[model samples]
Target: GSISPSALQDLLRTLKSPSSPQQQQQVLNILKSNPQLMAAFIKQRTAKYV
Candidate 1:
C-alpha cells in the first residue's frame, strides 16, 4: 500500500533535522529521483495555497 518503508524513512529523517544547504540538496536530489512524488507533493502544496 505504501512505497518502500526505508525510502520513506530516509526522506522523513532527512527532513526532521535542522536544515542546511547540504540537507536541502539531499531533498532536491530525492525529489529529482522521484518525480511522481515531487509532483504529488507540489500538487498538495498548491491545493493548500491556491
Candidate 2:
C-alpha cells in the first residue's frame, strides 16, 4: 500500500481482513519495511495477542 495513512490502514486490513497467506505476507512486508513501527507493533501486540 501507499506510505501514508493507508500504510497503517492497509496493515490493519491485512490483519483483520486477511484474504490469503500472500496478503498476510504483504502485511509482513509492510512491517518489515518499517523497522521502528514493526518493533513497536510487535512489542505491543505480544502483550495483547500472547
Candidate 3:
C-alpha cells in the first residue's frame, strides 16, 4: 500500500517534537520496517520535473 495522509501527519508530528538519539533511532526503525512508506515518501519528495 502507498503512504497515507494520516501516516505522514503522524510522522511529521513525531519529527517535530524534541527527541534523543535513541528516539531518533526508533524513528529510523519505524521507516526501516515500513519499506513502502519510505519508498513512496522518497518518490514524492524527489519527484522529477520533466
Q: What would the per-residue lDDT of candidate 1 be over residues 1-50, giving only the tens digit for each residue?
A: 75888777767755664646577667776677777777677566634885
Our model 3 lands, by Cα RMSD against the true structure, at 6.3
Alpha-carbon shift of residue 49 in model 1 (angstroms): 10
State TM-scores per candidate.
0.57, 0.49, 0.38
Worst 10 residues of 3 by lDDT: 41-50
Among these predictions, the greatest lDDT belongs to 2
Candidate 1 has its poorest 10 consecutive residues by lDDT at 13-22
| Candidate 3 local lDDT, residue 15 | 65
TM-score of model 3 vs. true structure: 0.38
Ranking by lDDT: 2, 1, 3
Candidate 1 Cα lDDT to native: 0.68
Number of backbone-clashing residue pairs for each candidate, in the order shown = 0, 0, 0
Error of 1 at 24 (Å): 0.4
lDDT of each: 0.68, 0.69, 0.62
* After superposition, candidate 1 runs with Cα above 4 Å error: 41-50
Q: What is the C-alpha lDDT profile of model 3 across 12-35, one tens digit per residue?
A: 754664656655665665577678
* Per-residue lDDT over 1-50 for candidate 2, one digit per residue giving the tens place of the 0 to 100 score: 44678676767776676557667677677777777787677566745985
In candidate 1, the residue pairs with backbone N, CA or C atoms under 3 Å apart (3 or more residues apart, or in different chains) clash, namely none
